[PDB]
Design a protein around this motif. Structure first.
Motif, mmCIF file in Angstrom:
data_model
loop_
_atom_site.group_PDB
_atom_site.id
_atom_site.type_symbol
_atom_site.label_atom_id
_atom_site.label_comp_id
_atom_site.label_asym_id
_atom_site.label_seq_id
_atom_site.Cartn_x
_atom_site.Cartn_y
_atom_site.Cartn_z
ATOM 1 N N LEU A 1 1.238 -1.378 -0.128
ATOM 2 C CA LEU A 1 -0.337 -0.087 0.419
ATOM 3 C C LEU A 1 0.698 1.379 -0.012
ATOM 4 N N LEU A 2 1.833 1.352 0.678
ATOM 5 C CA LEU A 2 3.164 2.462 1.268
ATOM 6 C C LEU A 2 3.921 2.512 -0.267
ATOM 7 N N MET A 3 3.036 1.748 -1.196
ATOM 8 C CA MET A 3 4.606 2.051 -2.364
ATOM 9 C C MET A 3 3.779 3.335 -3.398
ATOM 10 N N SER B 1 18.249 25.120 -0.996
ATOM 11 C CA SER B 1 17.739 25.569 -0.376
ATOM 12 C C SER B 1 16.758 25.018 -1.503
ATOM 13 N N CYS B 2 14.787 24.671 -0.823
ATOM 14 C CA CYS B 2 14.156 24.191 -1.853
ATOM 15 C C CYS B 2 13.131 23.522 -0.636
ATOM 16 N N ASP B 3 11.742 23.147 -1.425
ATOM 17 C CA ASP B 3 10.745 22.747 -0.882
ATOM 18 C C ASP B 3 10.705 21.164 0.241
ATOM 19 N N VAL B 4 12.012 20.155 -0.339
ATOM 20 C CA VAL B 4 12.109 19.275 0.276
ATOM 21 C C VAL B 4 11.688 19.269 1.292
ATOM 22 N N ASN B 5 11.177 17.874 2.113
ATOM 23 C CA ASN B 5 10.839 18.047 3.277
ATOM 24 C C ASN B 5 11.942 16.503 3.953
ATOM 25 N N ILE B 6 12.721 16.611 3.550
ATOM 26 C CA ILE B 6 13.514 15.304 4.398
ATOM 27 C C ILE B 6 12.275 13.767 5.776
ATOM 28 N N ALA B 7 11.477 15.247 6.016
ATOM 29 C CA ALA B 7 10.780 14.737 7.600
ATOM 30 C C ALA B 7 9.591 12.806 6.340
ATOM 31 N N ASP B 8 9.565 14.051 5.841
ATOM 32 C CA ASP B 8 8.561 12.749 5.152
ATOM 33 C C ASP B 8 9.325 11.407 4.085
ATOM 34 N N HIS B 9 10.210 11.464 4.233
ATOM 35 C CA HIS B 9 11.105 10.294 3.546
ATOM 36 C C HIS B 9 11.771 9.483 4.717
ATOM 37 N N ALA C 1 4.530 8.292 -5.401
ATOM 38 C CA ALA C 1 4.156 10.102 -5.350
ATOM 39 C C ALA C 1 5.720 10.576 -5.112
ATOM 40 N N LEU C 2 6.689 10.032 -4.675
ATOM 41 C CA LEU C 2 7.879 10.481 -3.794
ATOM 42 C C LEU C 2 8.804 11.185 -5.151
#
Lengths: 219, 214
Positions: free
Chosen positions: B66-68, B162-170, B73-74
């Motif tokens: 499911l998480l795939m 700098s950019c909007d990439v959110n490592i926490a989501d990874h 999406a990333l």
């Protein structure tokens, strides 16, 4: 009794494919899932046998979450009462069941404190849990202890360094061990409360007494 | 709304990020930053993931399957090293401070030679707010991610970006998948191979897994 239980048959067959060869199947508090007891732990299986998730299951409706897997298992645990090595408190305030191993350091530490637990109203009930597995020397030695006429003396003797006298009976340590595994026991000593709660770690008598008192109040 | 589920979670101090269907009627898949929970619609009962579908020849982790969706999406935030003759695609959680991640990256040509495409996501073991997290943010925010990643892994320092990439989501996705250390190798069906595995071993493993899940 005359009505077929063919869905449970699908569970057994589904588990057999996985190598899980013996099962006890009971209802679960969740619709369309059954509680399945295996030597390797509790599994929650859908009625059709197609989906499996390892326990435990928690009931989070109350003020504190409760592990209903372990709560349910207290029926299995209590059915083994006659195979327990029991050190009863004179003025009993709490009963704990402890999965123990004669080769485990803090099981020695705990047993040395038995007088102090008992003095505080805590009855301690022992089941065997060879942390090194069922083919270890400890399993063999603990079986002798559990088969002694005076279990309390045999256990005391072993923990003092006296050495077990061979003996045999029908008691299967494998059943104690499976229960431990089903309750989430890994490290010994594992102290289990009357509602199935497994205390995290070893606690000496004064700490344990306060914990038991508060646990009773809250749950 | 899933009010009952949210109410129970709030009581336990748990913040869901998503709530969606599950294979079991009356029960939802609940994504949190700590992992995946299965929770009844009435919010009464919880079991931690993962859930397996055992109806096939081999057990399948459907939580990870499911998480795939979340993972794929990333896509655009992945550092992809594609094999010329692509046979397999793997997604790898990596840390620039991890010795075995460096071994893996040095051998990228070998994985690519065997038809294995590698897609990186960031998983700084030190957690968020760490130097590794920030440096890896800088890397993922580069104009040329592959260049920046190769440069860092070759020991050439990290250039601020700098950019909007959110490592926490990874990080959260890795945690939901059962990742705990790096490198973590994730197959196209969500299966985690924990730790490092060599190119020839990986290729043989990948081929066998494909045969098993087809």
């Amino acid at each position: 009794a005359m009505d077929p239980e063919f869905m449970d048959a699908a569970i057994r067959q589904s588990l057999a494919k996985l190598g899980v060869q013996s099962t006890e199947i009971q209802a679960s508090p969740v619709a369309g899932m059954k509680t399945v007891l295996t030597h390797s732990g509790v599994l929650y299986v859908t009625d059709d046998g197609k989906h499996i998730i390892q326990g435990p299951m928690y009931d989070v409706s109350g003020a504190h979450p409760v592990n209903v897997t372990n709560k349910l298992l207290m029926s299995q645990l209590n059915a083994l009462e006659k195979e327990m090595i029991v050190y009863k408190a004179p003025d009993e305030k709490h009963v704990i069941t402890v999965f123990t191993d004669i080769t485990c350091g803090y099981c020695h530490k705990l047993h040395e404190e038995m007088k102090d637990y008992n003095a505080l109203g805590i009855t301690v009930r022992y089941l065997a849990f060879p942390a090194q597995g069922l083919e270890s020397q400890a399993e063999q030695d603990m079986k002798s202890i559990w088969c002694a006429k005076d279990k309390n003396k045999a256990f005391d003797d072993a923990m003092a360094g006296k050495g077990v006298k061979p003996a045999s009976c029908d008691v299967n340590i494998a059943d104690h061990y499976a229960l431990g595994v089903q309750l989430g026991v890994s490290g010994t000593p594992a102290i289990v409360l009357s509602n199935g709660y497994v205390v995290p770690g070893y606690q000496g008598p004064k700490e344990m007494k306060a914990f038991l008192d508060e646990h009773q109040k809250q749950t």
